[PDB]
Design an enzyme around this catalytic site. Structure first.
Site, PDB file in Angstrom:
ATOM      1  N   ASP A 290      -8.105   2.193  11.875  1.00 31.22           N
ATOM      2  CA  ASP A 290      -7.223   3.352  11.757  1.00 31.22           C
ATOM      3  C   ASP A 290      -7.455   4.336  12.893  1.00 31.22           C
ATOM      4  O   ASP A 290      -6.504   4.911  13.427  1.00 31.22           O
ATOM      5  CB  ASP A 290      -7.409   4.044  10.405  1.00 31.22           C
ATOM      6  CG  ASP A 290      -6.824   3.236   9.262  1.00 31.22           C
ATOM      7  OD1 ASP A 290      -5.694   2.720   9.416  1.00 31.22           O
ATOM      8  OD2 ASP A 290      -7.501   3.102   8.224  1.00 31.22           O
ATOM      9  N   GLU A 293      -7.032   1.996  16.680  1.00 33.78           N
ATOM     10  CA  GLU A 293      -5.733   1.385  16.961  1.00 33.78           C
ATOM     11  C   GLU A 293      -4.559   2.314  16.668  1.00 33.78           C
ATOM     12  O   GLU A 293      -3.543   2.269  17.373  1.00 33.78           O
ATOM     13  CB  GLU A 293      -5.563   0.088  16.158  1.00 33.78           C
ATOM     14  CG  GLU A 293      -6.429  -1.047  16.616  1.00 33.78           C
ATOM     15  CD  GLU A 293      -6.444  -2.235  15.648  1.00 33.78           C
ATOM     16  OE1 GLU A 293      -6.208  -2.041  14.432  1.00 33.78           O
ATOM     17  OE2 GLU A 293      -6.693  -3.359  16.113  1.00 33.78           O
ATOM     18  N   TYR A 374      -1.756   3.893   2.877  1.00 32.98           N
ATOM     19  CA  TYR A 374      -3.044   4.540   2.727  1.00 32.98           C
ATOM     20  C   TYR A 374      -2.990   6.031   2.982  1.00 32.98           C
ATOM     21  O   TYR A 374      -2.279   6.543   3.845  1.00 32.98           O
ATOM     22  CB  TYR A 374      -4.066   4.030   3.777  1.00 32.98           C
ATOM     23  CG  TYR A 374      -4.075   2.544   3.821  1.00 32.98           C
ATOM     24  CD1 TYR A 374      -4.826   1.823   2.883  1.00 32.98           C
ATOM     25  CD2 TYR A 374      -3.322   1.851   4.779  1.00 32.98           C
ATOM     26  CE1 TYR A 374      -4.845   0.421   2.894  1.00 32.98           C
ATOM     27  CE2 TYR A 374      -3.317   0.447   4.821  1.00 32.98           C
ATOM     28  CZ  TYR A 374      -4.099  -0.253   3.851  1.00 32.98           C
ATOM     29  OH  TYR A 374      -4.154  -1.631   3.800  1.00 32.98           O
ATOM     30  N   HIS A 423     -10.842  -5.839  -0.086  1.00 34.49           N
ATOM     31  CA  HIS A 423     -10.978  -5.281   1.260  1.00 34.49           C
ATOM     32  C   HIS A 423     -12.116  -4.268   1.269  1.00 34.49           C
ATOM     33  O   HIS A 423     -12.666  -3.911   0.225  1.00 34.49           O
ATOM     34  CB  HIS A 423      -9.679  -4.602   1.711  1.00 34.49           C
ATOM     35  CG  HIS A 423      -9.232  -3.525   0.776  1.00 34.49           C
ATOM     36  ND1 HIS A 423      -8.565  -3.796  -0.402  1.00 34.49           N
ATOM     37  CD2 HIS A 423      -9.389  -2.181   0.818  1.00 34.49           C
ATOM     38  CE1 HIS A 423      -8.312  -2.665  -1.035  1.00 34.49           C
ATOM     39  NE2 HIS A 423      -8.821  -1.670  -0.325  1.00 34.49           N
ATOM     40  N   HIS A 584     -13.786  -2.498  -1.911  1.00 33.91           N
ATOM     41  CA  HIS A 584     -12.745  -2.202  -2.886  1.00 33.91           C
ATOM     42  C   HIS A 584     -12.250  -3.500  -3.511  1.00 33.91           C
ATOM     43  O   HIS A 584     -11.549  -4.281  -2.862  1.00 33.91           O
ATOM     44  CB  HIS A 584     -11.603  -1.421  -2.232  1.00 33.91           C
ATOM     45  CG  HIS A 584     -10.613  -0.873  -3.217  1.00 33.91           C
ATOM     46  ND1 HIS A 584      -9.519  -0.124  -2.841  1.00 33.91           N
ATOM     47  CD2 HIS A 584     -10.578  -0.942  -4.569  1.00 33.91           C
ATOM     48  CE1 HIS A 584      -8.849   0.238  -3.923  1.00 33.91           C
ATOM     49  NE2 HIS A 584      -9.468  -0.249  -4.983  1.00 33.91           N
TER      50      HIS A 584
HETATM   51 CU   LIG Z   1      -8.968   0.245  -0.844  1.00 42.44          CU
END
Ligand SMILES: [Cu+2]
Ligand SMILES: [Cu+2]
Ligand code: NA
Ligand code: NA
Ligand code: NA
Ligand code: NA
Lengths: 620, 620
Positions: A290, A293, A374, A423, A584
Site C-alpha cells: 500500500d 506501490e 480497505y 491474508h 487475518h
Molecule cells: Cu484483513
C-alpha cells in the site's frame, strides 16, 4: 522559517513551473510522486534549501525520470532517466485504475468470459491491482495491472458481495492492451447483497445509545505554531506529511527541566504489505504494497467532526500534487487532539496516611486512508510519562472470492457461496533514533531463568541479559515472546544520575511475521517482513525497507542490500526498522463491513529520566 | 428476587446471629472469610436458598472451622474443624498485621539489630508478609508472618524509601512469639526521601493542563435493576462482589434478535501471585498470593468522582463482613460507566459512492485495591461488537531493598543505595464458559506454514489447524506467539447459519509465565502459573487454581489435583483457566511512585453471530 514545515501550495506551484520551463512536464508527462526532502545531517548553517523529489511518468512509453528540484533557488538539481526493467516501475497512478475496466470492456476474451456467466458488462466492476513479479517474461519493463471482477447490481450496491471467481486479466496500461485473460472455470456469483445501510439488512436502528459529550471548555493543552510544530505536556515535535508515507513525525523531544532532550529524529510507517494466502491462480499473485506501490497519503480521507474525530479537534490540511503538478488540499486530513487516559499513578499509603491519585492523558495524531476495499487508520500517541505508541486500525470490506464446494484450507466462508481468502497486513516502522542525540546503540534484552542450586538455594532467582548489536550483519533479530524479549536503544555517552546510559525500550506485540515460503516472490520482494527487527546505519538514500521503486521490482533492494554493508552501529547514527502485523483469518463477524482490529508497538523510557517524569502533574 | 444479588447488610447480620446462637462466634473467634455461594447447577426450581461460606479463626489456638450457613432458613448447614497442617492456614487477618511490629518492638534480638544500625524503634515500620512453606519444620501448623523493616523519618514520610536490608524476623501471631531474627549484615539505610507530594521533589506543578470535560447530558445508556443487574447495548450481566476475588461477573449474555444468548457463566480473577526473584535470604521466601492469602476485595478503595472515575459514573457499594461479623460497606467501591472507544467500522466506497463511519464504545466495570505498597486496578470491558476484555493496572510503590555495592543480577538501582528486586505479577482468570449454553469444547488454533510445491506453486499459501482438547490430561497448554496460537471455545451443538459451531476466540498477550525453578516451593504452590491455559470440567468445589486454603499450604492442591481426574471436556460443562502476567524489572522511572503498567486478555466472537452484530448502530 522551520525547515520541517509542511509543503505549501505555493511551493508545489513553483515546482510545477520549474519542471515546465525545464521541458520536463509536457502533455505526456504525469507526476507519480512529489514530496519534500528532509534537511541533510548538519543543517546548523541556517542555509535552508527547500528541495522536492519528483517521479515523472510518460504515458507515451518514453523513459520515466527521477528529478530533484530546489524551490528556494528555482533550479533543477538533477534529472535521471530510469531503466525500469532494472530498478522497478513507478508507483501506480490514480488515473490508471479506471483504464483497466474500460479496456477489458471491449476485449473479446473478457466479454466472452462474462457472456458465459450471463453478466452484463455494464454491471461488472474491475478492481485494478498491482502485478508483482512472476513467471511472465513479457511483463518485464512494462506497466502491468491485474484485474479481478465484481458485480454491482445497481449504482449504490456493494460490489464486494458479488465476486466473479475463476477469472482474471492482465493489462498493459501504457500500450493499452490486454495481455492475458485467464478463465479457470465458472463459479456461481454469490447472490446475497452486502449493503450495510439497507434497512432490511440492518433492521431497525438502535435507539438506546445516549450521547457522550467530550469538550474542552478552556481549549486544548497543546499549541500549534509555524503550521505544524506541536508543544504539549513537555513534548516537542513537528508533524510532516508525505504522499507516500503519510503522517511523518519529526524531531520528537521532551523538555526535561530546561534541557530539550531528543528522542526520535524521524518516525514513519515506511512500508506496508498485504500478502494473500490463497493458492488459486486467480489470486496467488495478490500482494499489495500500500505504501510503496499505491502511496497511502494520496488517498487520505477528509475527517468529519463528531464522527471520525471526537472532542476538541485541531486539523491539519496537507497539500499534495496532482498528476499535473497542481496543488491539491486534503481538507481536514489530519486530526490532532488530547484524550483522557485513565489513571496515571495511584497509591493509598497506610503508614503515611497520604492518598494520591493522578490521571493520565495522551496526545493523538491520526489520519485515515482508503485503498479500494480497505480502510486503515494510522494513530500516533504521546503519553505524559514519556511513552510513545503507534497503533494501526484496520477496517473496511474484506476482499472476497467464491467459497468452493467442498471447502477450503485457505479461504473462510462469510455467507452462502461467499469466501474471504486468508491474508496478512504487515507494517514496517522506520525509527530514525536520536536518544539524547545521535550516538545510539541497540541491545537485545532476554529474561534469564536460573537453576536451583548454590547461590540460588530456593530456586526463585531470575535475571536478564543484554546483548549489544555492534554491526549490521548481526542486527537482524526475531521476536521471542517466551523469553520476554525486548530491545533497548541507549546513548552510551549520556548517563542518568545513577551513571547508567539513558535509554528507551521497544515493546513489540510479537505477532507472526511473513508466512509465505522463503522461496516465494513475495518473500524476496518483502524481505523486511520476514524478521521483527532490523538496525541500520543512517544513510540519506536508505528511506524505505523495500527500496525506492517497489512496483514490479524483482527483489533484493531495500533492507537486505543495506545491511550487506555491515556498518558499525555501536554508538552511531542508527535507524531501527520494526516489522509488525495482523494475520487475518476472516470471520463471519467481519461481513459485510469489518469492525476495527488493531496492531502496533510502543517505546517506554528505560532510565532516560532520573526519576518519574510525572511528579509535577497536578491533582485537578 | 435474583439469586445473584449482592449480599446485603441484613444478610450479614443474620449470618452473625446464626453463628452466635450456634456457639461458633465466641470472643476468641474471628471471621477470616465470608461470602455468598453461587446457586448450584440446575436452579430452575425457583427454590432459592441464600447460603454463605465462612472461615472462622480462633485466636486462642483452637482449631479453625469452615461453616456453611443458610440465611433463608436460619440454620448452620455444616461445620467442619480444619487440620491446618494438612489443608493450609486461613487467610491473613487485617488485625494480625499490626501484631508483627508491636511484638518485634519488645524482642531483644530485634532491638539489638536496630541498635547496631542506630535506628529508633519508634521510627521503624514492619511490613507484615505471608510466610509460605520452606525449610522451617517448627512452622508447620502455626500461623507465621515474616517481617521486613523500613524507616519512617516522620509521620507523613514514605517508609519505602528507607529499607533496612540484611534483617528479617519470623513471628507466630497466635502464640505471640518471635521465632527467629536473622541478621545477615549491616547495609546503609538509603537516605533520600521518596515523598512524591513534597514540593522540593516535584518542583512547581504544571499549569499547562487544560480540563477535559466528559459528560452525558441524557444520562448513561445502561440500566441497573435489582441492585446489580446490568443491561447495556444488547449485553446482560450481573455484577457480583466477593471479599476474596473482588468483582465477579455473572451470566454474561448478549441479546441477538429475540434470543438472549449466554456467553460466560462466571468470570473472575481467581488468584494472583507476586513472586520475587532476589536470591538473598532476606527476601528469597517472598511470594504474595494477593487473592488467596490476603483477599483483595477487603482492601478495595473508595473511588472518588473526577479523580478515580471520570464521566457519568454509577457506583456500587458492596457490603462485606468485618472480623466480628458486623456488616461493613465499601462506599463507591465499584465504578461503572460507558466510554467512547474511537472508530468501530469505516469504509468509503469508490464504486457505490457511500461513505460510512460508526463509532465504538465500551462499558467499564472496575475497582481498585491496595495491599501494602502495591495498588492494583481491575477493569472489565464490554464492547459493542461482542468483544470481552480484562485489563489489570499495576501502580503504587515498588518494593525496595538496599542496592549492593558491586551491583546485582537480581535487583535494579532506583536511587543512591536504593534497589528494587525483580519480580512478577501473575493473574489467573477463571472463565466458567457458557457459549450458547453449557455444552462447550476448546480447540487450539495454530497458524500452519506451507511449503512451495505442487498445489502451492507460488509459495504463498498459508493455513491454520485446530486441535480439540478432549480430556483434562491433554488440556494444559502453553502459548506460542510465533505460530499465532489462540484458543477457541465453541458449542458443537449450536451452529450459525453457515452450519459452523458458534464460538469465541481467546487472544492472550503471550507474556512469560512463572520463571522460578520448577523444583522451587513457589512453583509447587503456584503450579497454575507455569502454564498459559488450563481447561477443567466444571465442579462445585473447584473454585480456585490454588485451592481453598493457600496460606502456608505445602503444594499440590488446586489445578494439578483437579486435572488428574482426566475428565471428558469435549462438549461438556467446562472452565477455562488463563494465566497471564507482567515480569517487572523496575526502572528509574518507577520511582518514587510508579506509572501504571497493564496486562490482560480478550475474547472475540468467532462465528458466534451470523454477520457483524453492529449493523444496527446509528450514525449519531
Ligand atoms: Cu484483513
Ligand atoms: Cu512490579
Ligand atoms: Na530487476
Ligand atoms: Na539515528
Ligand atoms: Na500439607
Ligand atoms: Na462451563
Amino acid at each position: 522559517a522551520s525547515p520541517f514545515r509542511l509543503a505549501s501550495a505555493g511551493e508545489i506551484s513553483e515546482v510545477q513551473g520549474i519542471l515546465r520551463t525545464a521541458g520536463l512536464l509536457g502533455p505526456e508527462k504525469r507526476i507519480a510522486y512529489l514530496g519534500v526532502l528532509d534537511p541533510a545531517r548538519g543543517a546548523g548553517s541556517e542555509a535552508e534549501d527547500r528541495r522536492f523529489r519528483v517521479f515523472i511518468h510518460d504515458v507515451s512509453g518514453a523513459r520515466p525520470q527521477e528529478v530533484t528540484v530546489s524551490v528556494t533557488n528555482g533550479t533543477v538539481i538533477s534529472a535521471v532517466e530510469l531503466d525500469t526493467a532494472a530498478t522497478g516501475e513507478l508507483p501506480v497512478l490514480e488515473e490508471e485504475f479506471e483504464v483497466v475496466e474500460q479496456l477489458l470492456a471491449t476485449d473479446e476474451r473478457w466479454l466472452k468470459a462474462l457472456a458465459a456467466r450471463n453478466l452484463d458488462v455494464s454491471k461488472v466492476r474491475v478492481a485494478p491491482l498491482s502485478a508483482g513479479v512472476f513467471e511472465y517474461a513479457e511483463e518485464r519493463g512494462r506497466r502491468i495491472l491485474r484485474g479481478l471482477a465484481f458485480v454491482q447490481d445497481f449504482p449504490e450496491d456493494s460490489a464486494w458481495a458479488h465476486p466473479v471467481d475463476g477469472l482474471v486479466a492482465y493489462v498493459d496500461v501504457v500500450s493499452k492492451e490486454v495481455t492475458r485473460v485467464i478463465d479457470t472455470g465458472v463459479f456461481p456469483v454469490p447472490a446475497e447483497h452486502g449493503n450495510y445501510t439497507d434497512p432490511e439488512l440492518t433492521g431497525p436502528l438502535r435507539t438506546t445509545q445516549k450521547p457522550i459529550s467530550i469538550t474542552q471548555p478552556e481549549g486544548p493543552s497543546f499549541t500549534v505554531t509555524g503550521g505544524n510544530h506541536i508543544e504539549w505536556e513537555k513534548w516537542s515535535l513537528d508533524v510532516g506529511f508525505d504522499v507516500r508515507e503519510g503522517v511523518v513525525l519529526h524531531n520528537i523531544a521532551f523538555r526535561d527541566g530546561d534541557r530539550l532532550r531528543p528522542i526520535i529524529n524521524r518516525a514513519s510507517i515506511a512500508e506496508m504489505v498485504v500478502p494473500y494466502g490463497d493458492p488459486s491462480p486467480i489470486r496467488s499473485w495478490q500482494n499489495y504494497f500500500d505504501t510503496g506501490e499505491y502511496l497511502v497519503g494520496q488517498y487520505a480521507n477528509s475527517l468529519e467532526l463528531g464522527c471520525d474525530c471526537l472532542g476538541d479537534i485541531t486539523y491539519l490540511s496537507p497539500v499534495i500534487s496532482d498528476a499535473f503538478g497542481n496543488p491539491r488540499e486534503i481538507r481536514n486530513g489530519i486530526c490532532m487532539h488530547e484524550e483522557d487516559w485513565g489513571i496515571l499513578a495511584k497509591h493509598s499509603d497506610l503508614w503515611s496516611g497520604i492518598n494520591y491519585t493522578r490521571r493520565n492523558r495522551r496526545m493523538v495524531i491520526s489520519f485515515f486512508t482508503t485503498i479500494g476495499n480497505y480502510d486503515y487508520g494510522f494513530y500516533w500517541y504521546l503519553y505524559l510519562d514519556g511513552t510513545i505508541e503507534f497503533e494501526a486500525k484496520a477496517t473496511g470490506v474484506v476482499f472476497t472470492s467464491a467459497f468452493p464446494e467442498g471447502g477450503s484450507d485457505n479461504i473462510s466462508q462469510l455467507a452462502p457461496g461467499l469466501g474471504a481468502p486468508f491474508h496478512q497486513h504487515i507494517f514496517s516502522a522506520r525509527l530514525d533514533m536520536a536518544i539524547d542525540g545521535f550516538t545510539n546503540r541497540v541491545e537485545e534484552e532476554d529474561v534469564v531463568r536460573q537453576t536451583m542450586g548454590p547461590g540460588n538455594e530456593r530456586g526463585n532467582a531470575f535475571s536478564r541479559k543484554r546483548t549489544v548489536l555492534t554491526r549490521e550483519s548481526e542486527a537482524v533479530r526475531e521476536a521471542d515472546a517466551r523469553t520476554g524479549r525486548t530491545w533497548i536503544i541507549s546513548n552510551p555517552e549520556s548517563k542518568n544520575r545513577l551513571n547508567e546510559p539513558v535509554g528507551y525500550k521497544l515493546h513489540a506485540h510479537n505477532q507472526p511475521t511473513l508466512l509465505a515460503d522463503p522461496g516465494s516472490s513475495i518473500a524476496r520482494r518483502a524481505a523486511f517482513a520476514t524478521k521483527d527487527l532490523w538496525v541500520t546505519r543512517y544513510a540519506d538514500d536508505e528511506r524505505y525497507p523495500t527500496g525506492d521503486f517497489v512496483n514490479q521490482h524483482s527483489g533484493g533492494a531495500g533492507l537486505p542490500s543495506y545491511i550487506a554493508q555491515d556498518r558499525d552501529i555501536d554508538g552511531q547514527d542508527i535507524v531501527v526498522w520494526h516489522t509488525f502485523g495482523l494475520t487475518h483469518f476472516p470471520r463471519v463477524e467481519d461481513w459485510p463491513i469489518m469492525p476495527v482490529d488493531t496492531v502496533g508497538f510502543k517505546l517506554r523510557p528505560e532510565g532516560f529520566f532520573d526519576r518519574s517524569p510525572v511528579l509535577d502533574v497536578p491533582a485537578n
